PDB file of C-alpha atoms (C1' of nucleotides) in Angstrom:
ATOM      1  CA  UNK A   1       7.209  34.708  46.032  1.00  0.00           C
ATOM      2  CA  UNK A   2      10.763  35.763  45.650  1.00  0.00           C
ATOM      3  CA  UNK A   3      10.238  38.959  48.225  1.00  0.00           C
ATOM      4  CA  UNK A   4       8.456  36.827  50.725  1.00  0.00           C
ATOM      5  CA  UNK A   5      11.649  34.121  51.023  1.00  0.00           C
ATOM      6  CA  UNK A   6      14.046  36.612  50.558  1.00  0.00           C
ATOM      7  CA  UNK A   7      12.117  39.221  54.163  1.00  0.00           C
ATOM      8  CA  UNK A   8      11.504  35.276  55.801  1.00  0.00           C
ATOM      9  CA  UNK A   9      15.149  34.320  55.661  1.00  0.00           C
ATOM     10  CA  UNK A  10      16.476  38.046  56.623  1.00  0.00           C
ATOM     11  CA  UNK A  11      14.082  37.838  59.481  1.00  0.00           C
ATOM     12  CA  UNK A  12      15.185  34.311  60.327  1.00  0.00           C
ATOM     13  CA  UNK A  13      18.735  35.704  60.199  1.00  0.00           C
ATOM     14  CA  UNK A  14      18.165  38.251  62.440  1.00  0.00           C
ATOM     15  CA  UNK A  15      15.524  35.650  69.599  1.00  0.00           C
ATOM     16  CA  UNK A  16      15.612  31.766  69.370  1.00  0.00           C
ATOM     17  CA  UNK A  17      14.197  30.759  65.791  1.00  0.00           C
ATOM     18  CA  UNK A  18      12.973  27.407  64.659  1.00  0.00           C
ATOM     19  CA  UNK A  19      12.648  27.295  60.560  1.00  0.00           C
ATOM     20  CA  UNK A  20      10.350  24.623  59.120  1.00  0.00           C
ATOM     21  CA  UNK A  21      11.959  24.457  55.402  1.00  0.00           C
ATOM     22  CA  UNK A  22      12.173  21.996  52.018  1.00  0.00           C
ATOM     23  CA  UNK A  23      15.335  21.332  50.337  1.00  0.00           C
ATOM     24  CA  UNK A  24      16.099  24.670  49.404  1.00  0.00           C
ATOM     25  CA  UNK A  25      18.090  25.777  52.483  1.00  0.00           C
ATOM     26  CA  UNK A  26      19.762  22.686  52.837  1.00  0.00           C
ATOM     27  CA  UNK A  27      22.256  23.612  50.709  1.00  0.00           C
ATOM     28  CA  UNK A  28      24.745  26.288  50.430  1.00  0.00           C
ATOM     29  CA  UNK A  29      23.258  29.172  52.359  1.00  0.00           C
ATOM     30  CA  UNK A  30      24.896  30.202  56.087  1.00  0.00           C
ATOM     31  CA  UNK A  31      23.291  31.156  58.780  1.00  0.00           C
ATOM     32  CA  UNK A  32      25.042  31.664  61.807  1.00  0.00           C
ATOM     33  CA  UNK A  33      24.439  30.605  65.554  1.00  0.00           C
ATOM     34  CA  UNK A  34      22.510  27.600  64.085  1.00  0.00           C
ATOM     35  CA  UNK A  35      22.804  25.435  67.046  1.00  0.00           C
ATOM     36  CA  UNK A  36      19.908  22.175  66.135  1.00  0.00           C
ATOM     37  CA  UNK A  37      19.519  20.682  62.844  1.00  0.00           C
ATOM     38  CA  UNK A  38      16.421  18.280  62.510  1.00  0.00           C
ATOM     39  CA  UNK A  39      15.264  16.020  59.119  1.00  0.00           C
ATOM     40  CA  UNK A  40      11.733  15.233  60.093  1.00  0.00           C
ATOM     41  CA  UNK A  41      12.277  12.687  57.115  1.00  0.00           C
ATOM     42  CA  UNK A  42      15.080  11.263  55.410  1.00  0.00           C
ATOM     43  CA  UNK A  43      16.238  12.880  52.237  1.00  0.00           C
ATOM     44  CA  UNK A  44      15.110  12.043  48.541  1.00  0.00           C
ATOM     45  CA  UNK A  45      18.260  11.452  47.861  1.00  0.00           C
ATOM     46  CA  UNK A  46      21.222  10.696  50.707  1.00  0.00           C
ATOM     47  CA  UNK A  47      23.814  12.831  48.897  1.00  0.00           C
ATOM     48  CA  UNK A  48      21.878  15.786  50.027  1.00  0.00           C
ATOM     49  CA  UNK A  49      21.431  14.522  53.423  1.00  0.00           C
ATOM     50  CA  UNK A  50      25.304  15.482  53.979  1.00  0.00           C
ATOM     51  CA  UNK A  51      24.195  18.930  53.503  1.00  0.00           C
ATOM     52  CA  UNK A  52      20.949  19.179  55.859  1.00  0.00           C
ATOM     53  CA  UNK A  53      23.104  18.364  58.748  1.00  0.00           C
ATOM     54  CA  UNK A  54      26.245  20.113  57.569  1.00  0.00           C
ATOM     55  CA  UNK A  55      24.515  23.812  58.140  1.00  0.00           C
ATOM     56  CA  UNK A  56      25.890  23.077  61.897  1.00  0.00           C
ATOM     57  CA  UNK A  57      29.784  22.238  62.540  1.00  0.00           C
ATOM     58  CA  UNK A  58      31.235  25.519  61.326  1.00  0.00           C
ATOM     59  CA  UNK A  59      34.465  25.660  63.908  1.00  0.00           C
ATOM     60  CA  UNK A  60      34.161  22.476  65.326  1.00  0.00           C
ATOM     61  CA  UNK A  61      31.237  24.205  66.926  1.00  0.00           C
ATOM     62  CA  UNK A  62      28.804  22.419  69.296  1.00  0.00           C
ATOM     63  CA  UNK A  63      25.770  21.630  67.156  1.00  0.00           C
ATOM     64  CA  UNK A  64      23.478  18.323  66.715  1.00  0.00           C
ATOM     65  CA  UNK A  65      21.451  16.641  63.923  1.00  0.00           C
ATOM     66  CA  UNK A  66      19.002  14.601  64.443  1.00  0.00           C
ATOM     67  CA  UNK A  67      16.703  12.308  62.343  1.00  0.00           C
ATOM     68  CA  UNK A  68      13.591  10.341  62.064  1.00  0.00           C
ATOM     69  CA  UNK A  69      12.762   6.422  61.476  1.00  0.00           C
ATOM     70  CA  UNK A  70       9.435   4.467  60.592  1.00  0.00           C
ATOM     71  CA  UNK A  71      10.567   1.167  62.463  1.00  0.00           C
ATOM     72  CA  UNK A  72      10.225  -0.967  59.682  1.00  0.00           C
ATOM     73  CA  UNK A  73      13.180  -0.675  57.072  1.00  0.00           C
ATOM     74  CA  UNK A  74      14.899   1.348  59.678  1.00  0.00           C
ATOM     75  CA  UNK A  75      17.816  -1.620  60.363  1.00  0.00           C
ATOM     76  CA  UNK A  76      19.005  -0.497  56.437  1.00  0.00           C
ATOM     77  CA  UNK A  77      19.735   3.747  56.328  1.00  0.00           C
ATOM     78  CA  UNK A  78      22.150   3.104  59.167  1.00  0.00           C
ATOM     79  CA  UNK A  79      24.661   0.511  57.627  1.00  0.00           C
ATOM     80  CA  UNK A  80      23.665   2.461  54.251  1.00  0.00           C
ATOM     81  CA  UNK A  81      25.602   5.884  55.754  1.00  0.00           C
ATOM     82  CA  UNK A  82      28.259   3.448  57.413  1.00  0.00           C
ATOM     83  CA  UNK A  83      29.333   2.017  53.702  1.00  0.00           C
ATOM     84  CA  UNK A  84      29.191   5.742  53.063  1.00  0.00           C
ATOM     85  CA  UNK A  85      31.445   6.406  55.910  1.00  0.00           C
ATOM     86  CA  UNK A  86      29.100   8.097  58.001  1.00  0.00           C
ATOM     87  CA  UNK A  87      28.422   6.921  61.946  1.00  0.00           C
ATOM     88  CA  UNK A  88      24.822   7.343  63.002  1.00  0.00           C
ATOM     89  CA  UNK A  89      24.647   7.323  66.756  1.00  0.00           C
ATOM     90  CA  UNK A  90      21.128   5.907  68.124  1.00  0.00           C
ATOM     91  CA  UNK A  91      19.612   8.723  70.267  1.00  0.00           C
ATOM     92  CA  UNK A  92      16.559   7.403  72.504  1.00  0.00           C
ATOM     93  CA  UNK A  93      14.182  10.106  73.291  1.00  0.00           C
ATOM     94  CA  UNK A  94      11.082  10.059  75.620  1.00  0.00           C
ATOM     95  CA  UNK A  95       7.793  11.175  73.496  1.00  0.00           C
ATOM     96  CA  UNK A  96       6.684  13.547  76.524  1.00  0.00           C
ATOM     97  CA  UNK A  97       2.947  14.788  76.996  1.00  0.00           C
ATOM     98  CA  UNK A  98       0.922  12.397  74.554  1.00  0.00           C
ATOM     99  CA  UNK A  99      -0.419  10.620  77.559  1.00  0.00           C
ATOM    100  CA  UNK A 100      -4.135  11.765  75.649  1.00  0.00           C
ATOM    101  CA  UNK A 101      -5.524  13.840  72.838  1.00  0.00           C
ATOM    102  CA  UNK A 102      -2.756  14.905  70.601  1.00  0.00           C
ATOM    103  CA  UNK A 103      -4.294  13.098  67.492  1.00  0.00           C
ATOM    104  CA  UNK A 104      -8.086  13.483  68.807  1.00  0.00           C
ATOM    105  CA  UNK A 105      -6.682  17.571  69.360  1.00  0.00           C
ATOM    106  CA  UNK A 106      -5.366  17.088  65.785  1.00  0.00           C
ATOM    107  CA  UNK A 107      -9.062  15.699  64.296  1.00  0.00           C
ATOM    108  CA  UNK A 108     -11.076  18.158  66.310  1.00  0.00           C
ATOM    109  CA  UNK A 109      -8.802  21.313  64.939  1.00  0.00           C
ATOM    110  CA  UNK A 110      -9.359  20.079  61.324  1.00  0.00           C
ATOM    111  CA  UNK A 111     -12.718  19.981  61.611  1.00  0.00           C
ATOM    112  CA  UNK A 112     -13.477  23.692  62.273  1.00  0.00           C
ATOM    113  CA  UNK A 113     -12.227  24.693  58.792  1.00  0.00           C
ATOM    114  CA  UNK A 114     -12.363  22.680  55.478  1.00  0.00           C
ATOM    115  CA  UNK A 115      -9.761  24.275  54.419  1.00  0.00           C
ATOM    116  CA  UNK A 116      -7.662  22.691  56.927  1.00  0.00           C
ATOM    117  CA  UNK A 117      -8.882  19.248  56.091  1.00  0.00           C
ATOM    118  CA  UNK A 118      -7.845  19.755  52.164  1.00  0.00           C
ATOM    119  CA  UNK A 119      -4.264  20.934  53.220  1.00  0.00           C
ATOM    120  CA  UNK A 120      -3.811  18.229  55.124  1.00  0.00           C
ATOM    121  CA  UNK A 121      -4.802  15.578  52.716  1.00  0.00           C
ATOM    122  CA  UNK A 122      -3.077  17.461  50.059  1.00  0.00           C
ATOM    123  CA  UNK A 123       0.347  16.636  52.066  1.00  0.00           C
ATOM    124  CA  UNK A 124      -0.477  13.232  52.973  1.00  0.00           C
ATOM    125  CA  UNK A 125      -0.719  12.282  49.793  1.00  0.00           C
ATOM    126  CA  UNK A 126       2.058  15.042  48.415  1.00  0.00           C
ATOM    127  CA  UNK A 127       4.598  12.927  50.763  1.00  0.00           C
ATOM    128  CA  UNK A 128       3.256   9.568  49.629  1.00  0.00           C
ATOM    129  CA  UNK A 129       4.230  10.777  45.947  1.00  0.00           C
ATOM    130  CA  UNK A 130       7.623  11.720  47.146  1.00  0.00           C
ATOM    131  CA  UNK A 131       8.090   8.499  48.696  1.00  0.00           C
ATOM    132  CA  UNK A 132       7.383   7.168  45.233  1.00  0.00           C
ATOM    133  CA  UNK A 133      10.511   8.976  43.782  1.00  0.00           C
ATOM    134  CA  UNK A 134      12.973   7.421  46.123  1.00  0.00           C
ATOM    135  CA  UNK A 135      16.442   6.468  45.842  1.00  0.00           C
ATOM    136  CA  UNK A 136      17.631   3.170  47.330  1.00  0.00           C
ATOM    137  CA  UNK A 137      14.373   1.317  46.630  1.00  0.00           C
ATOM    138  CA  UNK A 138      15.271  -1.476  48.694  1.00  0.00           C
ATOM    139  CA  UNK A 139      15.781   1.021  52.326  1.00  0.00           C
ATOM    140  CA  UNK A 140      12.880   2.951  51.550  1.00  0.00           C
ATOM    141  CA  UNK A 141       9.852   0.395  50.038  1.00  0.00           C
ATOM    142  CA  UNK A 142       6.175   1.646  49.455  1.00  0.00           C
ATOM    143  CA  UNK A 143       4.532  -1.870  50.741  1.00  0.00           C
ATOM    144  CA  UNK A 144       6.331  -1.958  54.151  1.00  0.00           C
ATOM    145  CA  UNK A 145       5.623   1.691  54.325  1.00  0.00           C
ATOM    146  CA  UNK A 146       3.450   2.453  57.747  1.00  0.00           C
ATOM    147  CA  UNK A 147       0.264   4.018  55.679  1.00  0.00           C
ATOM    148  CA  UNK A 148      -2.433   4.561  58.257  1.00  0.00           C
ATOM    149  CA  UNK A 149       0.768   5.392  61.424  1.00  0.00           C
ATOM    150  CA  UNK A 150       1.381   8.529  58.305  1.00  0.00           C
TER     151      UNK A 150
ATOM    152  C1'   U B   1       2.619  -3.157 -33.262  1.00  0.00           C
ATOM    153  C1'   C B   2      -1.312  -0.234 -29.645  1.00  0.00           C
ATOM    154  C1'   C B   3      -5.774  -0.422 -25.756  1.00  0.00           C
ATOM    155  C1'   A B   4      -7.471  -4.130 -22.059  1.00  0.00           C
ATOM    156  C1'   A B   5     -13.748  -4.719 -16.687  1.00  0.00           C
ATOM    157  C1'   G B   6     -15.351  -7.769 -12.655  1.00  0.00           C
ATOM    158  C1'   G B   7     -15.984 -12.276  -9.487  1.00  0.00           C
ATOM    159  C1'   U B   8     -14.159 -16.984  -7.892  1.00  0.00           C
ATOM    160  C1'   G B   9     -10.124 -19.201  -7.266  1.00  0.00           C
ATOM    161  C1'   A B  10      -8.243 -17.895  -1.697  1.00  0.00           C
ATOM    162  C1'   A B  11      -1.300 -21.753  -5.464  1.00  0.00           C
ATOM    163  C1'   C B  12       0.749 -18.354 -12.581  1.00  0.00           C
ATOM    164  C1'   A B  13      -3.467 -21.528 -13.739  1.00  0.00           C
ATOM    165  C1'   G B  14      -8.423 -22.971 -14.870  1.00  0.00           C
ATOM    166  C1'   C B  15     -14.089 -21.535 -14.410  1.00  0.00           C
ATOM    167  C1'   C B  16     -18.041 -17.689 -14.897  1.00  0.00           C
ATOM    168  C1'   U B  17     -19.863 -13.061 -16.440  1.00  0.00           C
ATOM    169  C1'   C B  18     -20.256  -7.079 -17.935  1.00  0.00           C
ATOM    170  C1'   U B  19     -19.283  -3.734 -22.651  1.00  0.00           C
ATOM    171  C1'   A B  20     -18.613  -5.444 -27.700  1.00  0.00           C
ATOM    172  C1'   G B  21     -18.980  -9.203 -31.312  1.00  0.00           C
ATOM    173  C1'   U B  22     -20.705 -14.330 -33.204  1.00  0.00           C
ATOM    174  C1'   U B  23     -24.377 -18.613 -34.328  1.00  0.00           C
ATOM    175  C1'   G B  24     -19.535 -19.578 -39.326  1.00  0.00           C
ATOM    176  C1'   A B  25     -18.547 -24.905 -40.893  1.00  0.00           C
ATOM    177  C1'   U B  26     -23.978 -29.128 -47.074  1.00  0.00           C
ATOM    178  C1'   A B  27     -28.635 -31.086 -44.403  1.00  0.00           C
ATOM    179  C1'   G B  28     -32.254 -35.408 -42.913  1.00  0.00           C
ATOM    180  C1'   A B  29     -32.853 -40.494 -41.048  1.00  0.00           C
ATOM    181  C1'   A B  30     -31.200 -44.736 -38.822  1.00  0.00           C
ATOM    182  C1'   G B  31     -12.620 -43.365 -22.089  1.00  0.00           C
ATOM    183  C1'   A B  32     -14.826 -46.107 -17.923  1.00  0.00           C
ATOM    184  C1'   U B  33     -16.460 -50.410 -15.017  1.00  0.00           C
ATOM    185  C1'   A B  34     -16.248 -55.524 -13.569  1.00  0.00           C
ATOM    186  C1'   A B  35     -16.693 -61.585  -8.927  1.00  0.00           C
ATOM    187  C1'   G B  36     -11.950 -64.977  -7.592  1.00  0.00           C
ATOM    188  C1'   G B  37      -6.728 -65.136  -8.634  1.00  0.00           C
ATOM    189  C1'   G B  38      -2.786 -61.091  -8.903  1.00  0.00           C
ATOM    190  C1'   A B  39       2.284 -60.788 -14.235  1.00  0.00           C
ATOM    191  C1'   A B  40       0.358 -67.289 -14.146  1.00  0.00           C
ATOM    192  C1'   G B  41       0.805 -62.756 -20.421  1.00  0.00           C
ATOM    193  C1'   U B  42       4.926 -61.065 -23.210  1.00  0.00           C
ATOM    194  C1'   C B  43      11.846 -61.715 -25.515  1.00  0.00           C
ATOM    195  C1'   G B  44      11.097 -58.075 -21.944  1.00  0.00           C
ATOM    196  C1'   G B  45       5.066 -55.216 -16.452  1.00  0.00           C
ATOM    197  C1'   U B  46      -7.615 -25.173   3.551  1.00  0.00           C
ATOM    198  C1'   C B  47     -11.360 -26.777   7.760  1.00  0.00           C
ATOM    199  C1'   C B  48     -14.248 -27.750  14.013  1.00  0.00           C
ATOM    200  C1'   G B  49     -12.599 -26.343  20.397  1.00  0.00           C
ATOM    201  C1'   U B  50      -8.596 -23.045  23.050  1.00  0.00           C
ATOM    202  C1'   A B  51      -5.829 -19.186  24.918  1.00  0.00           C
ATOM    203  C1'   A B  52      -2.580 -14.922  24.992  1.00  0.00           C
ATOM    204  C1'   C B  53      -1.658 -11.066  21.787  1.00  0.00           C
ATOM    205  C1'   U B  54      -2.489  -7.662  17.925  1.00  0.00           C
ATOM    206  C1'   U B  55      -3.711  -1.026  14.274  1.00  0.00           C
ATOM    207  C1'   C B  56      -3.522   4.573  13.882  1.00  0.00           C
ATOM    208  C1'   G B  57      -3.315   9.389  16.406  1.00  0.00           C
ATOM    209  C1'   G B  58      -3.492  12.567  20.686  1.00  0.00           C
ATOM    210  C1'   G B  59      -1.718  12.724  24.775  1.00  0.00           C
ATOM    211  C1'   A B  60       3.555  14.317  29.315  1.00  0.00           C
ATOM    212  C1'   U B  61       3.464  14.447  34.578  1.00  0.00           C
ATOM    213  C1'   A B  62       1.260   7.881  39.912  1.00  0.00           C
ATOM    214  C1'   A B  63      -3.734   5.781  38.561  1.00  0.00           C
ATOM    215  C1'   G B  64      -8.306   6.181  35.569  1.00  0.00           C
ATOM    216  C1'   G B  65     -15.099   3.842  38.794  1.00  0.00           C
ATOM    217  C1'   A B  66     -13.452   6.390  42.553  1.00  0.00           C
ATOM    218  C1'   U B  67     -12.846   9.829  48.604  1.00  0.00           C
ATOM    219  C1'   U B  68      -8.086  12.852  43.134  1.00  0.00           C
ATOM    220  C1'   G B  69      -5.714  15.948  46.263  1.00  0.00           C
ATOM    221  C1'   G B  70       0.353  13.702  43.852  1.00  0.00           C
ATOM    222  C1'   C B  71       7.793  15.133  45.198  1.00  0.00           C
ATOM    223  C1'   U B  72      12.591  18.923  45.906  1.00  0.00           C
ATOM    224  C1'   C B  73      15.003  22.992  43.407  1.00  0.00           C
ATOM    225  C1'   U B  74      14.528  25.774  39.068  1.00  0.00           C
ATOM    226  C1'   A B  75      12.394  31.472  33.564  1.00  0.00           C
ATOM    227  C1'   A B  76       6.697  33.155  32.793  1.00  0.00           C
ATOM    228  C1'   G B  77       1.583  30.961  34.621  1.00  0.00           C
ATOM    229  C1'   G B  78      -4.433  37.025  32.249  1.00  0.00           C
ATOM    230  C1'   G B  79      -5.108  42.436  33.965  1.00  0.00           C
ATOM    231  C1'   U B  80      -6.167  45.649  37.957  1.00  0.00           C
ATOM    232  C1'   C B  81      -7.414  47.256  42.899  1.00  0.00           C
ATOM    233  C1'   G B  82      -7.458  47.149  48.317  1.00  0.00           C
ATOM    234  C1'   G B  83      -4.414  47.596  55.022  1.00  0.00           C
ATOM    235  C1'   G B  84      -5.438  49.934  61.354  1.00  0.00           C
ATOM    236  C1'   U B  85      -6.216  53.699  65.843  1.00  0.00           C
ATOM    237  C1'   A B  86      -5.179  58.852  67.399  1.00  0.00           C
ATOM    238  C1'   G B  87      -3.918  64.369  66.920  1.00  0.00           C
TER     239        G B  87
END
RNA sequence: UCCAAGGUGAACAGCCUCUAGUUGAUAGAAGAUAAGGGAAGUCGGUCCGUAACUUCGGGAUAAGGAUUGGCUCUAAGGGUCGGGUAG
């Protein structure tokens, strides 16, 4: 509801904040003192992703974006940005305390509530449709996609 | 000069019939084929076996035997009601 985004995002606003949010903040709206700027996924569409990571920079100022890979196409968004004059910079980053449980601790809390199972199927397969509607077919391709690592 | 059924034909045609009309016309009796030769003649010789397809609407939303739940932003998505502890 209108009322509920518009008291999130004044909230937001207003001490560190982390905002999990679609598409519809990517794009023209400024808030300030955003320091970390992180695509879980790759855009839809790449002209957009220009804009998820351009919420940071105001000034020159000292902010990072970072984004996520599936291992398999992964050697094709790179040189994709580069034709589009955009330098990714490989960032390697330890995954720190999964040395046990974090899937099983996953399972375990979706089986207390029902509820929490359908939600979570829901955006499974919610993001496999989205994957369906993507741009550059050949970067992003449904058969090399990693179905049972997502 | 007017009216004008049906079925086969599956090529106008021809053939057969329904409704409706005829039995009229002196009566009785008693073209085809061919063995061998081949112009020697005369002026002149549609139906059985395959495969892909293939008609109308209504549906919108990735499918339509399966465990259906299916993208981002963007008008509305039936009405109403309901929030704590203390003085």
């Amino acid at each position: 509801q209108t009322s509920a985004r518009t008291k999130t995002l004044t909230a937001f606003t207003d001490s560190n904040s982390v905002l999990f949010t679609t598409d519809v903040a990517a794009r023209g709206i400024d808030i300030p003192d955003v320091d970390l700027v992180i695509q879980l996924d790759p855009p839809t569409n790449t002209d957009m992703f220009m804009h998820r990571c351009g919420r940071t920079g105001r000034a020159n100022r000292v902010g990072k974006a970072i984004t996520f890979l599936n291992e398999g196409r992964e050697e094709d968004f790179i040189p994709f940005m580069q034709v589009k004059n955009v330098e990714l910079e490989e960032l390697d980053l330890e995954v720190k305390g999964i040395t046990a449980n974090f899937y099983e601790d996953f399972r375990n809390w979706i089986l207390e509530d029902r509820d929490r199972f359908d939600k979570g199927v829901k955006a499974y397969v919610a993001f496999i449709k989205y994957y369906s509607n993507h741009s550059a077919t050949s970067i992003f391709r449904l058969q090399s996609l990693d179905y049972v690592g997502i």
